[PDB]
Write a protein that binds this ligand. Structure first.
Ligand SMILES: [Co+2]
Ligand SMILES: [Co+2]
Ligand SMILES: [Co+2]
Ligand SMILES: [Co+2]
Lengths: 179, 179, 179, 179
């Protein structure tokens, strides 16, 4: 469907900027038959660089000329049967930014907490097991919190944060839902 | 800050549609001094109905004339210490649609599952304890799934769904994150 | 669809979303549960801006999220308007509130008097209808350009700008579409 | 900022977001991990549309999410263009791709020949510059209106529309701004 989606979106955009096959073809150094072919679903072998040139001439992005991620749901639902190890939970092309994980935190030395520099999106966390020592903000003088099982947290986009199990408690587990 | 936010947004919108105090005042049956007062932060006693008239004359919504929810974060973070009972987890005015809950499911009779007709937003779920009998789609001939502890699910906006503990297992627990 | 009726429906949606019953919400607002139920029955019209801000606050959201969209002033999808600076306001619509089109008669031809607009929320398209325009933008050390009749321009959000007719040319006219 | 360079950065962001290393991602694409690392070093320019669709698929997202925005063709926030139907394309910008302004010369004055546009993704503002326009919209049982010089109109997304000059009036001219 990449080729098919591109074929449809290419035609819509070309029409939108009032170009006929010949007009777009000239700008790209192609023949109008070649542009007609792309709109007939034959664009599959176009390279990333060529797509960039086409988007440029059409004053838009490759993204605007390609289809959305797709649908992997079953009547609207998708299920997943069951120092840091990441256990990936269910994801879906219908909500690409959703990345939920069960994180096993195996280090219990807060001095050795390493900061993720911040995310582009928000994050919700729940302490599944053990006790977590969370740190955030400025790596040099961070905000901190000892979080027992059952505690929950929200971390806003771009806020640096790190986690370790509470000093000498061995290990802990968190569910992290980035969205 | 409702009054202060309104004062600033009102002035910006009025200016945007090229109205001076007198022009807006006439349309509302008010004096220009009264409109000037609102822009000086004195709009706190305006009623919901009056706000609706002001938004109408300015061709916009009450929402466009009022401030965003606000910031309740501490350097970008907010934490919460620890047939259906809802245990509300952390929420934040910085991401209003985020509503995470620990749901105790106390009914284990799938025949008695009642369908939530669907949400405006998406939902992620994780089976915390026990085994869940999930149903979704058409209440009369639903899709179903038996989900053991550790299973995860995603439910798209407006998809009806219901949950019960697996037949005769007593009770179960889920973390539901609506966003 | 009154302001009261829209609030009534959105208030109920949000209250249920955060799993509060009438009594729980009433306890946070200095009201009885019966009064909260009344609001949900369309009786919130007299609520003040200040009170609406508190309601939004305890529900962890904004007044905007609890009030209806601007409205629909269209006739099956369309709306038609018959026919130093004078602004002739063209058609506007509650279905696209940021759209503010204007025919601007520029009656000063002394660039030295161009007064800068601090920038807009939103983009802007301009088209010179008559005369010659002396345009200025950026840092009020501004960039400058002479725009003859038929010239068109795009100014991105927040870019400050100002204009007059070209020196000693008398007057000019342009159409400015903010969107 | 090449298409290759943008893809390189976004691919790496996404791969890390779903916690896959080079080897894990390589195993889903029929490539070696060294080749995946090369793409992240800017060497993906020859990747085909088909291959990009597969990459997006295994990463649970869209080609759009893995490719750069349209780009910036502005000069400190602005871009300027000097000066049956003939379309004179006015200024456009990659910073607002949906903006397509045009001066349309309408050379047919027989309403019977108005050919309907199935509707647009996006809104549209129109202003009659010369002559009289016979506008049609909705169900190609259409609504109709005569628009004299100076009239303005707004047509919402997806509403089909068509126009000619008013019967026997020769020709007309309008400016159409799609945004
Ligand atoms: Co994180
Ligand atoms: Co639900
Ligand atoms: Co402006
Ligand atoms: Co159109």
């Amino acid at each position: 469907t990449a080729s098919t989606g591109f074929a449809e979106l290419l035609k819509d955009r070309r029409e939108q900027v009032k170009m006929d096959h010949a007009a777009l073809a000239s700008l790209l150094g192609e023949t109008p038959e070649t542009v007609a072919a792309w709109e007939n679903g034959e664009g599959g072998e176009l390279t990333l660089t060529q797509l960039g040139r086409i988007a440029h001439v059409l004053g838009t992005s490759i993204g605007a000329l390609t289809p959305p991620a797709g649908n992997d749901l079953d009547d609207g639902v998708i299920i997943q049967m069951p120092y840091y190890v990441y256990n990936c939970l269910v994801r879906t092309k219908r909500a690409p930014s959703l990345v939920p994980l069960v994180v096993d935190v195996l280090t219990d030395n807060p001095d050795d907490a390493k900061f993720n520099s911040g995310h582009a999106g928000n994050e919700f966390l729940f302490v599944l097991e053990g006790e977590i020592h969370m740190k955030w903000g400025d790596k040099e003088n961070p905000k901190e919190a000892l979080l027992p099982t059952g505690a929950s947290m929200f971390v806003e986009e771009h806020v640096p944060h790190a986690f370790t199990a509470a000093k000498g408690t061995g290990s802990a587990k968190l569910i992290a839902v980035n969205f």
